Symmetry: C2
Amino acid sequence: EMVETVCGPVPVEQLGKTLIHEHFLFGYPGFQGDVTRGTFREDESLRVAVEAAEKMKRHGIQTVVDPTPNDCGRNPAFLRRVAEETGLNIICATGYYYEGEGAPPYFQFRRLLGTAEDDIYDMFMAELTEGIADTGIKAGVIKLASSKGRITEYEKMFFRAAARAQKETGAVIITHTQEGTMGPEQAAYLLEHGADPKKIVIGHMCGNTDPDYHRKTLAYGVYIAFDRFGIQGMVGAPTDEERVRTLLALLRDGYEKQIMLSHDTVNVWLGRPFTLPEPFAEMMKNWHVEHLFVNIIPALKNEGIRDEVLEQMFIGNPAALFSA
Amino acid sequence: EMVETVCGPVPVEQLGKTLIHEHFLFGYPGFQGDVTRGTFREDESLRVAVEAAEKMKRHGIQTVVDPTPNDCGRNPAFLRRVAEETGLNIICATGYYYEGEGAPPYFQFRRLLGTAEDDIYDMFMAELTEGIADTGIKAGVIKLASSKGRITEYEKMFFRAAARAQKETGAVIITHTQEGTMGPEQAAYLLEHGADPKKIVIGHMCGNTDPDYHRKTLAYGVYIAFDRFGIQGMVGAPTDEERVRTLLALLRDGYEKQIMLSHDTVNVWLGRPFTLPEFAEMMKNWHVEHLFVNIIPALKNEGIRDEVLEQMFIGNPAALFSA
Ligand SMILES: [Co+2]
Ligand SMILES: [Co+2]
Ligand SMILES: [Co+2]
Ligand SMILES: [Co+2]
């Protein structure tokens, strides 16, 4: 009845209103090489991350799951500073990103050595049950990710190791799907290797606008996340209007106990700062941690979605997910 | 008359006997994510790196070029510690690894933003002329790398940015070729964009065993490096026997003023320790003493004169780093 947060064990019944997928920090693999022009400025980054946490608190959020992959700049000690300052519960992940935008050379080399899959399992177990580096922080979820239209041989090593670690620990699995593909396949593959559907969240499901695709995924008994609200135009993403359309169809079908919502924000980008071209910039203007509460939830309520359904998604579902 | 080292500017005439391509530290992109089990043990790592430096010094080496890419664990401050302890000159690089085993997602994303090539040029300029991060250390070479049988669109951004930076600074370019491919192509592409051949070293040329391939590359007036002595069986590499045969053919043709030798050692691996299966026997000579204990004696057995050896290890690095 406990879950590991960046501040240690917290009762699952105390998690309350939760955002299932947000990043305080994130960097695309390779950001480390641009350190000269893209140095991590700790004080300012903490100020920004604390501000994001305070914005979430204003809307009643008590818990955030931050599934930043190990190869994408994950910094549990930094998350702990945010949580210590704000009182927000933050749950972090153990896992690597998908092959296309991850850093596969390292575990590809170890695959050639014959140890990669066992090494990954060993990493998962260490980070779930002992601690991440010298931080003393345990991950509360395993992060998995697949490529567009396939789960690659590289990715499958992590999927199998995740299923094994889940069987041993009861840990929650959170996933990334790329461009609205592989939802059913991820669920099928994980269950095939003994993972518990009630402990799995198939992510970025809002990337697909065909409700039959979602129904196919939901039939495995897993949770799904519409976790990219505010992301429009980029990353192959549909519009928020399309996201809302798909979500309403599923809620009207009675799937509320399997659905969670988030933004997948990046509050501090690692590496060099940037600005989106006016094309994407305007389309992306709502990509921030208050968007669900200021814009999306009101749009849902304008479409007849009741408070009890909303509370199921934000409070009931995370509580069930993290409970044995 | 100066070159930037990890300890600051040093007269080129003082570089002396040089190894053109060795790594004190190296990690494959992704090693950072395995920090829990693959901790960087700095004290032991420094001890190992210093030991390697002392072995080099015993054979008269005064200077090492360490071209560890920015995305492969480059650590200029660590290199400075090695240099401070040993008195060795160490020259580091600015650059990214090839697309296949580097970390392309970052600059691929900036390419979608439309600024990537300009950002890379800016990075090169910053690290050559200002300093790397907050270390105060400037890079002395630009490192470029290409894939097997292809200089990819991603890689070409770095090639073009490097030529632009070279024109502005006169900086040396050191390259990686993958599996004995793209030597002529790298030289041709760099020269197309105005790079100076007398400031270019095409690396891993020992990866190809056809001397005609080397001659095609040498025709551009660039340097070539037989820089993987001791690597056998792995990374698609030929045998040292084949490397020596190829080298002797080129020395016979009188190409010594364009050739440099090295091992491409990785003295400390970043991430988790590993062992090669037995493969390990084939790789047993991959260490910083191999050129001096094994390869050079074999060349001398074949009648290669001291002045030719000195040209490769002393004359060539001096000419390369001189205006
Ligand atoms: Co994702
Ligand atoms: Co995400
Ligand atoms: Co190389
Ligand atoms: Co190298």
